[PDB]
From a paper:
Ryanodine receptor type 2 (RyR2), an intracellular Ca2+ release channel located on the sarcoplasmic reticulum (SR) of cardiomyocytes, is essential for cardiac muscle excitation-contraction coupling. Structurally, RyR2 is a 2.3 MDa homotetramer consisting of two functional regions: a massive cytoplasmic region, also known as the cytoplasmic shell, which comprises several regulatory domains (NTDs, NSol, SPRYs, RYs, JSol, and BSol domains) and the stabilizing subunit calstabin-2, and an activation core and pore region, which comprises the Ca2+ binding site and the transmembrane domains. Dysregulation of Ca2+ handling, characterized by aberrant SR Ca2+ leak, is a pivotal pathophysiological mechanism in a spectrum of cardiac disorders, including heart failure (HF), atrial fibrillation, catecholaminergic polymorphic ventricular tachycardia (CPVT), and other arrhythmogenic disorders. Here, we solved the cryogenic electron microscopy structures of ryanodine receptor 2 variants linked either to heart failure or inherited sudden cardiac death.
We solved the cryo-EM structure of the RyR2-R420W channels under conditions that resemble the Ca2+-induced Ca2+ release (CICR) that occurs during systole. At the beginning of the systole, when CICR is the highest, the local Ca2+ concentration in the dyadic cleft reaches 10–100 μM or higher. Here, we used 40 µM because this is the concentration at which ryanodine binding and lipid bilayer experiments result in maximum open probability, preventing RyR2 from reaching the closed or inactivated states. Under these conditions, RyR2-R420W + Ca2+ reached both primed (27% of the particles) and open (73% of the particles) states, suggesting increased open probability and Ca2+ sensitivity. The pore remained unaltered compared to the WT RyR2 states, confirming that the pore exists in two discreet conformations independent of the conformation of cytoplasmic shell or ligands bound. Surprisingly, the BSol2 domain was not resolved in either the primed or open states, suggesting that the increased dynamics of the cytoplasmic shell induced by both the CPVT mutation and Ca2+ destabilizes the metastable BSol2 domain.
Residue numbers in the entry:
A (entry chain B): 4100 to 4209, 4237 to 4310
B (entry chain B): 4872 to 4967
C (entry chain A): 4872 to 4919
D (entry chain C): 4480 to 4524, 4555 to 4871
E (entry chain D): 4727 to 4871
The structure:
Amino acid sequence: VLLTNLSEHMPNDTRLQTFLELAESVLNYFQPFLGRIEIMGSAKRIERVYFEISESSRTQWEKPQVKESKRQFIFDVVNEGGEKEKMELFVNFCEDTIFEMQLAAQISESSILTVRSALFALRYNILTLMRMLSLKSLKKQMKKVKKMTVKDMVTAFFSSYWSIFMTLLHFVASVFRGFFRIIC
Amino acid sequence: ELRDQQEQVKEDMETKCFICGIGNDYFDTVPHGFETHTLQEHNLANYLFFLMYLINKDETEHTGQESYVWKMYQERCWEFFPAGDCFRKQYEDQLN
Amino acid sequence: ELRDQQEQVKEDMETKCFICGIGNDYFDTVPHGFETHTLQEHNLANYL
Amino acid sequence: FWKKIIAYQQKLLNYFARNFYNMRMLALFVAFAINFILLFYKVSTIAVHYVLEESSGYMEPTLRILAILHTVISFFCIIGYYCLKVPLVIFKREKEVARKLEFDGLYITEQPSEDDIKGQWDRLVINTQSFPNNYWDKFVKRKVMDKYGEFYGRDRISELLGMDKAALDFSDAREKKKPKKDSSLSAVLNSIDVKYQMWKLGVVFTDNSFLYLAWYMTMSVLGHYNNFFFAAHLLDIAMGFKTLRTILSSVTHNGKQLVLTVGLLAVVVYLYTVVAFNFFRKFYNKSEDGDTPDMKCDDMLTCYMFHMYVGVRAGGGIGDEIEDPAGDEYEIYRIIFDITFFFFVIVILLAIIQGLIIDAFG
Amino acid sequence: TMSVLGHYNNFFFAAHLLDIAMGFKTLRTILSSVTHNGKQLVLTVGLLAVVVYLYTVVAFNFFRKFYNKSEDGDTPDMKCDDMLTCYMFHMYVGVRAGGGIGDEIEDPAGDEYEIYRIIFDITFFFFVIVILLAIIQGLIIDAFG
Ligand SMILES: Nc1ncnc2c1ncn2[C@@H]1O[C@H](COP(=O)(O)OP(=O)(O)OP(=O)(O)O)[C@@H](O)[C@H]1O
Ligand SMILES: Nc1ncnc2c1ncn2[C@@H]1O[C@H](COP(=O)(O)OP(=O)(O)OP(=O)(O)O)[C@@H](O)[C@H]1O
Ligand SMILES: [Ca+2]
Ligand SMILES: [Zn+2]
Ligand SMILES: [Zn+2]
């Protein structure tokens, strides 16, 4: 806290900067528990206040019922509340939430496969097209190249893309079948 | 009216800070400035945790600022809440 | 148009003072400032 | 040897890439010709035959020629898209995965959400040797290696990225490599990278526009088996034009709210069906002949179908269809039933459902 | 020219009542509201014609025995044996009907295609009557506003 206060109040001191790099890790560890607010001080100036936040406070602040109350309070305070009474409503909500998180401790103390199926369909169905090139069984195509002509050139060029489109159709059909099986 | 009131509520939260009420642009002059202001400087959770901490802490161990805020809370005076001003604006000049 | 004209009339009365025409925020910088201005400083009944 | 066929192949590639849009105009004109010709069918005779009726006789062969032409043009439009826009999509995907791998370490420090098909499929490309095939930065692997090699293990990073550490420094120093000729079939089929091509095919298959063109081509192919399948190609103008595309998008702009409102309507009509089934059942005869009655609410499936079909569509409501209640002991109850049905279903809910889409358009 | 033709047929003088619609300001505004968004209006009408045509295709292929429009059993007047007639029936008696094409075509109860025809009618009512026609009207009303 002292290092953070000094850093925020001395913004342009390399001498304190060096201490900051030397103490980076401690500041990182204490980051979750370091509470920092701004208030309207007695000297008619804005001041920053540093304080301790307990871990249990966060564990209860991310309670579900606390989030629901937070949403309700925000909605009500921003629609059905004045700017004068906004702070009074906020502090009353803070008291209510403190009581709620005190009760939460007492009570507490004691899709993916749709993506996976599509990915598997991709792998399998692209492998179906890839097996030809991986088996290297293009010896008949090489023989055709030995008798190369413009007609054979154009037909092979078209046939490659036709095979790609065939593979896409198979992929789409497989995805539809997988989705049907999943929903049923 | 109900739907666009809800939309107005949301847009107001992403446009202005809850406590100070300053617009997001002034903080957004620098990158991530509004997020920094709403997560570190002015945070609802931070204020609530400060109130809980001030309640839990012993009275004799209060600092000057904590005692001031405690007296204001006990007299139900909310002047300590920053209204239309922040640390960056109050020290806008010699800081920057 | 008639309904939202009536709503505009109302909102204008709770937003600005009738005589001076200054906005409520300037008076509301302090608590209950607009109410103080509209009930003690600038009041229709007081002028009448 | 190959230099005289590869050049012609690339020439065909460039020709299709250049004429992609013109063939997309021609494919739209041909379908609007085919459907206009199709509009002159009649049923003539049991087995019925669909015969093209015309005073002339010169549109029947024209329909077959146009069907073949449309099929060929759609195939050429697929080829043109694959030549033109696929490399840009691959470039963007390769840039995004590289940026995430370097700046955020999406596969070293963190992991994908296991529900992101894109992120999970991109796991394959990092291991491939042929990475930034299209992206400029050919050394993102070395950058990741330097950045995360000591904290996360040099061997671990090398295995993840499918690299050999010695080769980079040996190439920076002196080296003796030997190039090989593409003439050898063994050489070229070894040079082909199976894993990167599989990843590329996955990207292309997951691309939306390629799926749209594949659907177009499938419809064109099915048009040969049944000529009326060519009528689905008239929906293509609805995406070609801007405001029609806006109208189509307006349907799904508020899809969640629309589906929930439809479910609420189905629940309300179901509650009314429950009430009618329990109390007002003799009013649901729908036959004029006294010999046989056709009761529409003896079985509740039939009753719910009657209320959802003939009830929502009717302007006045279910009372426009069901029997008049005058003189009955349940007259006032049935009257309240009909008035509330008309108010809640026709006046309120249907108006909300329509207004959602109209407001989305606006 | 209208005045001259009025001599040959006196009813041609009725076209001169449109002149007040341009003489007055708000009537001129109403007339201009029709063509203020003419491009969007024409495109929306074309989309409606395409949708009703797809529905006509579906009805012609599958739901054809439901389109008899004669009460006398002696002679049937089938409105969808020829697709020109079917498209005219859908565009004329279908768009104008409040409930949709199902208000006019025969009831599907007891048929093997009951659920398919019911989905057909409900989707026709939703897409044509509820959605597209409302958009077409709203374009001109908003132009006036
Ligand atoms: N003083 C403030 N404290 C906190 N948030 C503020 C403040 N002023 C404005 N905001 C806005 O409120 C939002 C923070 O909301 P919060 O962190 O509770 O969750 P959220 O935005 O509802 O979503 P999620 O829970 O998924 O993160 C941001 O949009 C932020 O800009
Ligand atoms: N100069 C002004 N004098 C009086 N009221 C003003 C003036 N300027 C604005 N107002 C507003 O007019 C309202 C005062 O109205 P008034 O006291 O006559 O009764 P009201 O608001 O109609 O309700 P009620 O009679 O129940 O108190 C307040 O909303 C006040 O803010
Ligand atoms: Ca002390
Ligand atoms: Zn603030
Ligand atoms: Zn005043």
